[PDB]
Short mmCIF file of C-alpha atoms and ligand atoms in Angstrom, two decimals:
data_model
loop_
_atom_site.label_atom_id
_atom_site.label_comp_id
_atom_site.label_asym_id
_atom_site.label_seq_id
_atom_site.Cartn_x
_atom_site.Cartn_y
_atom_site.Cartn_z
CA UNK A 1 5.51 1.78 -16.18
CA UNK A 2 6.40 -0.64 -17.70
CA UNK A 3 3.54 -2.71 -16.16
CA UNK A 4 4.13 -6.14 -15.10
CA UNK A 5 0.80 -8.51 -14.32
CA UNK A 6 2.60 -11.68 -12.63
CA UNK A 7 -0.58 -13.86 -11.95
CA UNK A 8 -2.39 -17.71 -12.52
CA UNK A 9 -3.58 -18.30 -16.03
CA UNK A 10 -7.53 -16.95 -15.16
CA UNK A 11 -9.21 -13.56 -14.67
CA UNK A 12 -9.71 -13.90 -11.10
CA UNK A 13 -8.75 -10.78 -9.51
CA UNK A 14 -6.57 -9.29 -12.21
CA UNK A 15 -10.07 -8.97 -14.46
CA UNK A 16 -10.72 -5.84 -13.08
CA UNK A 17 -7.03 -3.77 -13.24
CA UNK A 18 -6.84 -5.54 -16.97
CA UNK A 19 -9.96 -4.01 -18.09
CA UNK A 20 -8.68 -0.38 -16.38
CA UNK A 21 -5.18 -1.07 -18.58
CA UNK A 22 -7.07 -2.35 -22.03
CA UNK A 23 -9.64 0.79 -21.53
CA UNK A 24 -7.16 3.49 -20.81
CA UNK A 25 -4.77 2.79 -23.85
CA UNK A 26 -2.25 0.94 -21.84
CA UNK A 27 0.39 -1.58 -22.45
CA UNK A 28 1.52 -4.10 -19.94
CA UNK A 29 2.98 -7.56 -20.14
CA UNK A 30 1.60 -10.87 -18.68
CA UNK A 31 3.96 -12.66 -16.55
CA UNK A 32 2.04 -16.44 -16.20
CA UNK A 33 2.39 -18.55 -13.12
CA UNK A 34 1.76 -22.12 -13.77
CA UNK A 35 0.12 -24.08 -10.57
CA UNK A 36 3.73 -26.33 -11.16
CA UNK A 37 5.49 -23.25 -10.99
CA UNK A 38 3.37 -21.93 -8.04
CA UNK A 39 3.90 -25.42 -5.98
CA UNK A 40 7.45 -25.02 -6.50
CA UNK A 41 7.40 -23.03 -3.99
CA UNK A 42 10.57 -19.79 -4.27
CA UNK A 43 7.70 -17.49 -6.26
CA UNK A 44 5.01 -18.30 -3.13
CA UNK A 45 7.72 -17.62 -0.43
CA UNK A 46 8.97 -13.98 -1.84
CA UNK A 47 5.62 -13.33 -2.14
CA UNK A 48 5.17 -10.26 0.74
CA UNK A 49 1.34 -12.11 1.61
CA UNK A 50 2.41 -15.01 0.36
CA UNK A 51 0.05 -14.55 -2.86
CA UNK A 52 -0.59 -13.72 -6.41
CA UNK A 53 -1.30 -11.08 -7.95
CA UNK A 54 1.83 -9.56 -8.05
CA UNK A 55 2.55 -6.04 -9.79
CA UNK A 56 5.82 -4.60 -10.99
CA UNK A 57 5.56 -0.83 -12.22
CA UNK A 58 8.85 0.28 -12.77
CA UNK A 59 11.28 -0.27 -9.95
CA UNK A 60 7.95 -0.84 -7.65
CA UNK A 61 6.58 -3.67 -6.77
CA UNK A 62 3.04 -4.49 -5.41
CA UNK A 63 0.57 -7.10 -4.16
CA UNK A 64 -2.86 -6.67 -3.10
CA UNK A 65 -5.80 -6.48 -6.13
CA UNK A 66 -7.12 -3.40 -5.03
CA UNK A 67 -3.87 -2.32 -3.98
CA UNK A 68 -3.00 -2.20 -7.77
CA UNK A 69 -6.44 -0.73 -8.78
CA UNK A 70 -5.85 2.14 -6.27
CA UNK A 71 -2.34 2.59 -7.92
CA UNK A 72 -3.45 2.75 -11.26
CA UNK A 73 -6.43 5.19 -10.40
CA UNK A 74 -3.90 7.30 -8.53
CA UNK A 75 -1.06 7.57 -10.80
CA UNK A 76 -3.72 7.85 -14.09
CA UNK A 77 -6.09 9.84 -12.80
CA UNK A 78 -8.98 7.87 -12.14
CA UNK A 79 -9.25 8.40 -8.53
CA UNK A 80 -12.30 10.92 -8.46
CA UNK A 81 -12.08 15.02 -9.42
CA UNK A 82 -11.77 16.35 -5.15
CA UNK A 83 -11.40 14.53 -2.13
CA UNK A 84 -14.94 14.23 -1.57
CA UNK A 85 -15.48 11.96 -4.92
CA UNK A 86 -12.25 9.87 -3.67
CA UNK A 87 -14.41 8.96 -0.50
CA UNK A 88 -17.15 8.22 -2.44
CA UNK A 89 -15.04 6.24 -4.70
CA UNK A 90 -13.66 3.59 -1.73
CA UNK A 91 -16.86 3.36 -0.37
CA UNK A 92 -18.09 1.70 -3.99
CA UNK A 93 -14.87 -0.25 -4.19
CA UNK A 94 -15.19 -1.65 -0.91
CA UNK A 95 -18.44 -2.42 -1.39
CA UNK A 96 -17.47 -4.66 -4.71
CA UNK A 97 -14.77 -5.96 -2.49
CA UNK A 98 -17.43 -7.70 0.17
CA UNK A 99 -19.56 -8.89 -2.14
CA UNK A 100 -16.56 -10.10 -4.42
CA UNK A 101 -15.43 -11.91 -1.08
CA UNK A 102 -19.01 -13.44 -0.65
CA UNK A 103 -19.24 -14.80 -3.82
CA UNK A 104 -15.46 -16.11 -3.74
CA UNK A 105 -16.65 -17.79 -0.37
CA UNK A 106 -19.70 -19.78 -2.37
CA UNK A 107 -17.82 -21.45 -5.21
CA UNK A 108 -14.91 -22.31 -3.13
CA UNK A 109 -16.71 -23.66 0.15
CA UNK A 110 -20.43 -24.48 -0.50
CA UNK A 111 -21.07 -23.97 -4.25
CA UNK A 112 -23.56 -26.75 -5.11
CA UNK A 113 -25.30 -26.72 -1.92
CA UNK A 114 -25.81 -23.13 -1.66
CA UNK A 115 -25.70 -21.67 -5.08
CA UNK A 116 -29.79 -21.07 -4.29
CA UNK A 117 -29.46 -19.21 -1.42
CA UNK A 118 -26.91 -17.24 -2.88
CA UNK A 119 -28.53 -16.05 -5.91
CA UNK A 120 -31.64 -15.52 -3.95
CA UNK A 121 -29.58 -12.83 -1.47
CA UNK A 122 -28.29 -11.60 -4.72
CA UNK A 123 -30.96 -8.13 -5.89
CA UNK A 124 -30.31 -7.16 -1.94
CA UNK A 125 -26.39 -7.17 -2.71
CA UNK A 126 -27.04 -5.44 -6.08
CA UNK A 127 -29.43 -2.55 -4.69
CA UNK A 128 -26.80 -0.93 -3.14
CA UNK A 129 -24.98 -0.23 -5.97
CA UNK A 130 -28.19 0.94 -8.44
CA UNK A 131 -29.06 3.68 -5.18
CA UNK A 132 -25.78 4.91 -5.78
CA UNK A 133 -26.37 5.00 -9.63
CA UNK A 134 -29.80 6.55 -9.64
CA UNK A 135 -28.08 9.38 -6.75
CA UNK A 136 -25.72 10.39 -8.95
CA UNK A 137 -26.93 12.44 -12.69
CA UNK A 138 -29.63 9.75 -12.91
CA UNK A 139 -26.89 6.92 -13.48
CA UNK A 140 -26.43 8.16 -16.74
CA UNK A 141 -22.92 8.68 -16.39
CA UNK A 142 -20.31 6.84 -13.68
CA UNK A 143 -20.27 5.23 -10.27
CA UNK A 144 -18.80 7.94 -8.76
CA UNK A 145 -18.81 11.41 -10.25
CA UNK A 146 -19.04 12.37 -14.14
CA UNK A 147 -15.55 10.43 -14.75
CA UNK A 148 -14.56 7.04 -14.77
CA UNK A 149 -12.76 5.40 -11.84
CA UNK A 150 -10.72 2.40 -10.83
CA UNK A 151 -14.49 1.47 -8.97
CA UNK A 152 -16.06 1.35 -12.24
CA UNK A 153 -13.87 -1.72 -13.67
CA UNK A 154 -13.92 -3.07 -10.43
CA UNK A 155 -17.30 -3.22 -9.98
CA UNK A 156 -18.16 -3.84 -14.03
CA UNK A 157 -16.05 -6.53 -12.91
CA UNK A 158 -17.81 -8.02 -10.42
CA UNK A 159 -21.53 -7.49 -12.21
CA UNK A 160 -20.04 -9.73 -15.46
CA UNK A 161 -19.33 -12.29 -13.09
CA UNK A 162 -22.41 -12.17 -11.74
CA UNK A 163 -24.24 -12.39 -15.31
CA UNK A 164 -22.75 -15.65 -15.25
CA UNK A 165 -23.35 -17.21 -12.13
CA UNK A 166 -27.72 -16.24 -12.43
CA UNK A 167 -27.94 -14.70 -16.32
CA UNK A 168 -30.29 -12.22 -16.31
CA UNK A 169 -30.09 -11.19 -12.47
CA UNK A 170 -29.46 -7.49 -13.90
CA UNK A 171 -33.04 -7.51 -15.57
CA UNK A 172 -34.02 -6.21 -12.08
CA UNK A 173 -32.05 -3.22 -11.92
CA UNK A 174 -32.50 -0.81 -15.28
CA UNK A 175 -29.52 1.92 -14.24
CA UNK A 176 -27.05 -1.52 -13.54
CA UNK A 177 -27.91 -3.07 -16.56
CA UNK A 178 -27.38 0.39 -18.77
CA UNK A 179 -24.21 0.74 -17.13
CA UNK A 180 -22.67 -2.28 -17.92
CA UNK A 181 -23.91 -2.29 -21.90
CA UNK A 182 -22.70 1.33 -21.60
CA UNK A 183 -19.37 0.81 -19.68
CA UNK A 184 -19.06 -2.73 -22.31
CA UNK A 185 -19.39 -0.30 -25.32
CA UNK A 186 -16.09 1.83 -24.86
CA UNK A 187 -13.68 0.67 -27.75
CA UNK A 188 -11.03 -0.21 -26.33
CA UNK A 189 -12.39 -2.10 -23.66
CA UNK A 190 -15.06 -3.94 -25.87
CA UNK A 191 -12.06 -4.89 -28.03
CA UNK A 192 -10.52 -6.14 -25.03
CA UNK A 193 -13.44 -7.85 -23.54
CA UNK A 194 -13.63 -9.84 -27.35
CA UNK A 195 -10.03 -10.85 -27.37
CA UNK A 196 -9.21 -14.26 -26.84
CA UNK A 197 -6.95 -13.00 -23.90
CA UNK A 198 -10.10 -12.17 -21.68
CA UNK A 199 -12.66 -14.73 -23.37
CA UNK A 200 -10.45 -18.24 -23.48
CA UNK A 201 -9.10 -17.14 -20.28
CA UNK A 202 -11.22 -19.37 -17.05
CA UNK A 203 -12.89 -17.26 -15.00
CA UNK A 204 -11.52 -18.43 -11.21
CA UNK A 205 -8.67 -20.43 -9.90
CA UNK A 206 -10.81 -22.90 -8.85
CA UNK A 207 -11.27 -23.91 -12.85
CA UNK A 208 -7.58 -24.53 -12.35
CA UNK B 1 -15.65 18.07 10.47
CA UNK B 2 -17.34 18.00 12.45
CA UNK B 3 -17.42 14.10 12.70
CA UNK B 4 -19.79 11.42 14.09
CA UNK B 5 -19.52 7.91 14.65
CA UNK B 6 -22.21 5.70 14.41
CA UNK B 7 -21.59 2.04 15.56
CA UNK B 8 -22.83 -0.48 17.93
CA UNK B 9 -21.10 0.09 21.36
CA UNK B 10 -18.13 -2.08 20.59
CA UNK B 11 -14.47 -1.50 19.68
CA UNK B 12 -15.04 -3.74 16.54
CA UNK B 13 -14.51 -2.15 13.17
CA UNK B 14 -14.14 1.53 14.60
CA UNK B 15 -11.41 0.95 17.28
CA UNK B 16 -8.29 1.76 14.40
CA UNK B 17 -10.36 4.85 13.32
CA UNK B 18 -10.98 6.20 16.52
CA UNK B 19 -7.22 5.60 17.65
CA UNK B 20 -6.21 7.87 14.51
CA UNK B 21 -8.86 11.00 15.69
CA UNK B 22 -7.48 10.49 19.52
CA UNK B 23 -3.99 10.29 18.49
CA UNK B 24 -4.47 13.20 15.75
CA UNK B 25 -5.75 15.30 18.53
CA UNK B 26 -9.41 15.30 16.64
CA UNK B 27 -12.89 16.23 18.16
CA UNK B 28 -16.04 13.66 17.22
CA UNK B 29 -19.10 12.69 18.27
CA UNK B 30 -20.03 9.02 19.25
CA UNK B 31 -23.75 7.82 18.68
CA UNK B 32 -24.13 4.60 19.82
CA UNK B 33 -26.81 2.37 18.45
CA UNK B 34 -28.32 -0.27 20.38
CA UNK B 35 -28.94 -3.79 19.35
CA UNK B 36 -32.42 -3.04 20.05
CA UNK B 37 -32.74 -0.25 17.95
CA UNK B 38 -30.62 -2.03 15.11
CA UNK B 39 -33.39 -4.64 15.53
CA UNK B 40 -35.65 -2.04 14.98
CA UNK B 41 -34.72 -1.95 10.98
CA UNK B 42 -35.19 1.84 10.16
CA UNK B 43 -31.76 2.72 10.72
CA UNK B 44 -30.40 -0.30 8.85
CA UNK B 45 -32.55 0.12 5.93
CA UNK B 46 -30.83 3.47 5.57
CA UNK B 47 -27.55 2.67 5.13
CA UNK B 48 -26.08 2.12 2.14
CA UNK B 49 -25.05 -1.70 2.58
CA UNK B 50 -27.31 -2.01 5.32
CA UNK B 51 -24.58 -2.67 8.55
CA UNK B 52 -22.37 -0.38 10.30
CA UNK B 53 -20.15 2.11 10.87
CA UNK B 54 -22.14 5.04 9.20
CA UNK B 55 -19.61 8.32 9.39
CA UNK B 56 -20.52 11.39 9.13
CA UNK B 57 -17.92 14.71 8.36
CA UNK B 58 -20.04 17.96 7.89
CA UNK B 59 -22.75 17.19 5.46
CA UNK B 60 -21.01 13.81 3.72
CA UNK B 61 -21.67 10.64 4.51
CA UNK B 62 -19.74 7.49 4.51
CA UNK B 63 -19.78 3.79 5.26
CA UNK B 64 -17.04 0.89 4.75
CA UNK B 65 -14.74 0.81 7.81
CA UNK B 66 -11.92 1.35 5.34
CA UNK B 67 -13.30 4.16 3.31
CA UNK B 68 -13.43 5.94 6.64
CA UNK B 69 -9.57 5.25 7.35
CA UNK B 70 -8.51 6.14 3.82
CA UNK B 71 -10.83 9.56 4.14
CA UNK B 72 -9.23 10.57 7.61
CA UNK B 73 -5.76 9.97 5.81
CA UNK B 74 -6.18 11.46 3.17
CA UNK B 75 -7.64 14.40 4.30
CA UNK B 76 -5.26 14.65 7.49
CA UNK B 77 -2.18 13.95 5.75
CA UNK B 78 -1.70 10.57 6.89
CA UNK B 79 -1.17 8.75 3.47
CA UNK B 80 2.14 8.82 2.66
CA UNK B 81 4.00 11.62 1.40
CA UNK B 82 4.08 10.50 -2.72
CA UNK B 83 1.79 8.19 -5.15
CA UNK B 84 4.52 5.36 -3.98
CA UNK B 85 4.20 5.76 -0.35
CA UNK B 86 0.73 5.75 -0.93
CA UNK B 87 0.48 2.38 -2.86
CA UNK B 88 2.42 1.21 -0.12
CA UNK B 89 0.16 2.16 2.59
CA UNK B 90 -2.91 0.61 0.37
CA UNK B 91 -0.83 -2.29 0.25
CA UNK B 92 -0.10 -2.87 4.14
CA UNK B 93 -3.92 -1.66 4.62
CA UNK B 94 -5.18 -4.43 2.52
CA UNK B 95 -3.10 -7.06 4.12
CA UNK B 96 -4.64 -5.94 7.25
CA UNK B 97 -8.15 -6.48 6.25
CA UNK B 98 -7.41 -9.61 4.93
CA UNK B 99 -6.24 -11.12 8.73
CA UNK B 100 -8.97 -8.91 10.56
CA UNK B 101 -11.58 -10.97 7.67
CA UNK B 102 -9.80 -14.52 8.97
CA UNK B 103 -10.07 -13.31 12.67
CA UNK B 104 -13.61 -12.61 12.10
CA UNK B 105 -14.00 -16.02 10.19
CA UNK B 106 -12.62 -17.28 13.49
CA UNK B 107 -14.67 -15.97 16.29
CA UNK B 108 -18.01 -16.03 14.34
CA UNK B 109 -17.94 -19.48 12.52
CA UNK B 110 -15.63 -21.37 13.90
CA UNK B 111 -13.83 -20.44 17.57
CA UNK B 112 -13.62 -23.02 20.23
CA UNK B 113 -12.86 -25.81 17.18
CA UNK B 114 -10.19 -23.51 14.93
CA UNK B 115 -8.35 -21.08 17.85
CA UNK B 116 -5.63 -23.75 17.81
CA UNK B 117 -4.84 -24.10 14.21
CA UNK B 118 -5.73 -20.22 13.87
CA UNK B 119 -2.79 -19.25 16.26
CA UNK B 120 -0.44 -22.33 15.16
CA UNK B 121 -0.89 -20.76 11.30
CA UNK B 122 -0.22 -16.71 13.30
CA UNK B 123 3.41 -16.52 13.09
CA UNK B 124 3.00 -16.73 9.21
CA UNK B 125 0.22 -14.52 9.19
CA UNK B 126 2.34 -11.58 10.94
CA UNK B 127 5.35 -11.78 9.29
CA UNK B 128 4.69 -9.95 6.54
CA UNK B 129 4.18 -7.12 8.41
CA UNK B 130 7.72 -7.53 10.30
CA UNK B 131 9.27 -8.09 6.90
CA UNK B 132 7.49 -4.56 5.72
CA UNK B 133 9.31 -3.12 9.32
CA UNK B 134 12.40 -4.08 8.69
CA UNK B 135 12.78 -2.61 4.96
CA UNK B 136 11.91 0.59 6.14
CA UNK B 137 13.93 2.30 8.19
CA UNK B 138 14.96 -0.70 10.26
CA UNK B 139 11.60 -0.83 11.74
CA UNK B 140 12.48 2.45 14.24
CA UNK B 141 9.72 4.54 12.41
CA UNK B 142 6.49 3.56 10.98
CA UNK B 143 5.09 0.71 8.71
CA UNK B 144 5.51 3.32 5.73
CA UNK B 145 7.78 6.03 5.76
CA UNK B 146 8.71 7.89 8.29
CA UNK B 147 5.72 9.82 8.70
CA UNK B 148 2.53 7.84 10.46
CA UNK B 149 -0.26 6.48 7.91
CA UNK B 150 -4.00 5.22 8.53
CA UNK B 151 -3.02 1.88 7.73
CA UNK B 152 -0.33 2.18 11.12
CA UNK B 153 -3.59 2.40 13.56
CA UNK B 154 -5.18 -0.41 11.56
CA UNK B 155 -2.34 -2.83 11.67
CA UNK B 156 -2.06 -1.72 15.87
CA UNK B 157 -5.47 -2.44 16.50
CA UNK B 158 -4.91 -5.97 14.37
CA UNK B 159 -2.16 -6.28 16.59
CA UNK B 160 -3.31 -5.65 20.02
CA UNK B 161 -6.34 -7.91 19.06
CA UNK B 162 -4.29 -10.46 18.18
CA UNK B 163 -2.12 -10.18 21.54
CA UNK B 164 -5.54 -10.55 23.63
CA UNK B 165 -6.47 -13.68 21.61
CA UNK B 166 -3.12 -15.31 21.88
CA UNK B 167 -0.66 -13.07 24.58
CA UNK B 168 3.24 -13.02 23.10
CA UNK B 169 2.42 -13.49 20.31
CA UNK B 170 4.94 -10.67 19.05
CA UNK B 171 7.75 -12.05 21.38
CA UNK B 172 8.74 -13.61 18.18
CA UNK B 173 8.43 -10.24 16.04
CA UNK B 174 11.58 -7.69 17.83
CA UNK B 175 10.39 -4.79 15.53
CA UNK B 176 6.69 -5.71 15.72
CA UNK B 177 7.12 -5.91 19.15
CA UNK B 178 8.93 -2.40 19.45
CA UNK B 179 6.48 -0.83 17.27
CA UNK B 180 3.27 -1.70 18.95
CA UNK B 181 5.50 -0.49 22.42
CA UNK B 182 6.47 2.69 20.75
CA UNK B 183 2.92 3.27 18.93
CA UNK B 184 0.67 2.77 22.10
CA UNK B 185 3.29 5.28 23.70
CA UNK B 186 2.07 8.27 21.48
CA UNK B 187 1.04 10.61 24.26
CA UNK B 188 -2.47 11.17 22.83
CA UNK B 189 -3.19 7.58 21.70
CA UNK B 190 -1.62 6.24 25.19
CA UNK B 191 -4.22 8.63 26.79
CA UNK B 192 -7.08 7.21 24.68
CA UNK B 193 -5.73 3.17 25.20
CA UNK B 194 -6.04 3.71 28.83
CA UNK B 195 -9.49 5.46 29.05
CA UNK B 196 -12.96 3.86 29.73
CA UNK B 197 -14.11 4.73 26.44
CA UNK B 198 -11.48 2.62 25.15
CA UNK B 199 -11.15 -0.19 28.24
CA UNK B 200 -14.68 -0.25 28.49
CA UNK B 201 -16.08 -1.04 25.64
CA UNK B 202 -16.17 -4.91 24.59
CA UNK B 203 -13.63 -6.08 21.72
CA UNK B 204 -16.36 -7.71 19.08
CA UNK B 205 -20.08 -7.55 18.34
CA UNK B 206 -20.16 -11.09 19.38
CA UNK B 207 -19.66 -9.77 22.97
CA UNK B 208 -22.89 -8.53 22.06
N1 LIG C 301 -6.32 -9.89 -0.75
C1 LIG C 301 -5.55 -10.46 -1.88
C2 LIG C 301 -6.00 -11.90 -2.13
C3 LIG C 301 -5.05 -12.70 -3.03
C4 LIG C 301 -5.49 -14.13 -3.29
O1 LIG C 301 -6.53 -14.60 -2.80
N2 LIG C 301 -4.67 -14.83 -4.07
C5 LIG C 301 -4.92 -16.22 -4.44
C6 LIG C 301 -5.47 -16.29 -5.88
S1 LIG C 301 -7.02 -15.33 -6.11
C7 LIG C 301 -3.62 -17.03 -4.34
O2 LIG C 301 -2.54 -16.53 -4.70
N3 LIG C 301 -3.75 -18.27 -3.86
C8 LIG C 301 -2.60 -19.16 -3.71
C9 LIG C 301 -2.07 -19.32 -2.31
O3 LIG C 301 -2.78 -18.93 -1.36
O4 LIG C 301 -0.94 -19.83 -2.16
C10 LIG C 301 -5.78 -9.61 -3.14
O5 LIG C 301 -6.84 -8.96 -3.23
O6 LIG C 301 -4.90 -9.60 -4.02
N1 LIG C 302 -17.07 -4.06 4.96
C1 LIG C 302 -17.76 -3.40 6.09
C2 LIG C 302 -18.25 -4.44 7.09
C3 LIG C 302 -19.28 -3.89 8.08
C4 LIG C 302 -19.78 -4.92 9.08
O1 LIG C 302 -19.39 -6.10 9.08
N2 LIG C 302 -20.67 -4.45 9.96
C5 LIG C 302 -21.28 -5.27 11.00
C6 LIG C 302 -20.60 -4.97 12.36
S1 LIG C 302 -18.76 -5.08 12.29
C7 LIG C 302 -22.77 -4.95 11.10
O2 LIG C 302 -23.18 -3.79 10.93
N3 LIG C 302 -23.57 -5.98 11.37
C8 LIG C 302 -25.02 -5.83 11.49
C9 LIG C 302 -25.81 -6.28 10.29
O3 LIG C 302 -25.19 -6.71 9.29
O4 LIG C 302 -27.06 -6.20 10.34
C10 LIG C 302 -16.78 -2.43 6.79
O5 LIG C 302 -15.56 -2.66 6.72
O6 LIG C 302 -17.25 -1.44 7.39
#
């Protein structure tokens, strides 16, 4: 630290490393990009991928969502207990990661028109993740091990955003739908999750 | 160890990870599976997000392409030499598998009708990784450090793809260029470029 979030006014794919920061007692500061800002062009071009978000930590800068989440799990300890958990703990993340990319591919290039389809596909890209639950101390505890990891907000994360999109499509899956009242109940992140600074927030760019 | 990979017989999602085990002078096991038997449905229905590459090391098993790189790195000392070197491997990594996802958006939904805006919109697509060159070192060592990283046989097997679907495209990338040169000239990894297993074996599932 000090933590710098440089990103578009919406959760988007700074939801995730927020919640990590707001649950493990961090501070950080928001750096807003306005789309007028953004289509100004200088921010875009010194961009290294020519996108947001950015991270500062310190003298270091980053870019790349899970490239920050990885960062933060790494330098706070949230990264697994042995090698073998930090395996276990990119095969979860990358498995939020597809589906995130799946569901950022229906609202921004078929939305209406396959919304259906989508949430019918949906249990069969949710089972996945309640096998890997009910394999590990009955999904009582974490994704990956008995301690919380940068997967966990990731893919809490991606689960709220699903509640949205078809409410209720965690009925289906008991361990899932403990896990996120359970993950949801830690202090500091159910204060965060409350605050106007996640709630008034939109959800995706494309509300932009 | 020991290690298996499972995958269809393609160079597809496997070919960085299996240039890192050549090149790191590794021993593994290749089971091929046959669209026939993937048709089949037992073997899908047992893996975790139900596609391929499974990976086996001793008794754990993983899946996610990228899980697989990051475990082999990790656990072979190819992941920088700090936490920043690391973030900055992630970081490169992730760009990577965000042009290998547009490549594969290419090819699969959209090939004959996008190639020529696809390679028109390249140059800007590879640049950050030219950029990331020639802050370190000048470009004369690796994409992160001086010591080679996972995410260096990813971004050559993005590269060499890239150079079949559109050749020269690095004449306008000097250090890119070099790299990929000095790279495929790795003794071990040269051996492995130039063998059947390698040469033989189509590019994409599509081929399929
Ligand atoms: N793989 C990147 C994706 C970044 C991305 O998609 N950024 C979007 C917002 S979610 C953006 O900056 N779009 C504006 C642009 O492309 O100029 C990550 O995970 O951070
Ligand atoms: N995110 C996964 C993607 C895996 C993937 O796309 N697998 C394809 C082949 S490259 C597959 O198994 N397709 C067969 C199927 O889905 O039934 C990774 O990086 O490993």
């Amino acid at each position: 630290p000090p933590y710098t979030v440089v990103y578009f006014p919406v959760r988007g794919r700074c939801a995730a490393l927020r919640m990590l920061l707001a649950d493990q007692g961090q501070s950080w500061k928001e750096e807003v990009v306005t789309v007028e800002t953004w289509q100004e062009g200088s921010l875009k071009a010194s961009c290294l991928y020519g996108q947001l978000p950015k991270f500062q930590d310190g003298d270091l800068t980053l870019y790349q969502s899970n490239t920050i989440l990885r960062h933060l799990g790494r330098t706070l300890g949230l990264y697994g207990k042995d090698q073998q958990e930090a395996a276990l703990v990119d095969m979860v993340n990358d498995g939020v990661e597809d589906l995130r990319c799946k569901y950022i591919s229906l609202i921004y290039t078929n939305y209406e028109a396959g919304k259906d389809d989508y949430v019918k596909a949906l249990p069969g890209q949710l089972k996945p993740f309640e096998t890997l639950l009910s394999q590990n101390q009955g999904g009582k505890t974490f994704i990956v091990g008995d301690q919380i990891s940068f997967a966990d907000y990731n893919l809490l994360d991606l689960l709220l955003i699903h509640e949205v999109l078809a409410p209720g499509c965690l009925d289906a899956f008991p361990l899932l739908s403990a896990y996120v009242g359970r993950l949801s109940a830690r202090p500091k992140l159910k204060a965060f999750l409350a605050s106007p600074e996640y709630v008034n927030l939109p959800m995706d760019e494309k509300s932009l």
